[PDB]
């Protein structure tokens, strides 16, 4: 059946604050994209220099 399709566990690659399934998201998502966009912003500042 199509209901036999189950997503495998991704917990080795998974980020730290999204590990437990019993905690809601949208509480630390802003921090995650703030980190990634800070990486992109620092890269853009360096190549602008």
Ligand X SMILES: CCCCCCCCCCCCCCCCCC(=O)OC[C@H](COP(=O)([O-])OCC[N+](C)(C)C)OC(=O)CCCCCCCCCCCCCCCCC
Would you count residue 43 as binding ligand X (CB under 6 A)?
yes
Q: Which residues fall within 8 angstroms of residue 18, CB to CB, at 6 or more apart? A: 25, 28, 32
Residues near another protein (CB under 8 A): 1-11, 15-16, 18-26, 29-31, 33-35, 37-38, 41-42, 44-46, 48-49
Ramachandran bin of 26, using left for φ above 0, alpha for ψ from -120 to 50, beta for the remaining angles: left
- Of positions 11, 29, 37, 38, contacts ligand X by CB under 6 A: 37
Judged by the rule CB under 6 A, the positions of this chain that interact with ligand X are 37, 40, 43-44, 47-48
């Amino acid at each position: 059946s199509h209901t036999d399709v189950k997503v495998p566990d991704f917990s080795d690659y998974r980020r730290a604050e999204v590990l437990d399934s019993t905690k809601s998201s949208k509480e630390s998502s802003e921090a995650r994209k703030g980190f990634s966009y800070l990486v992109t912003a620092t890269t853009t500042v360096g190549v602008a220099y």
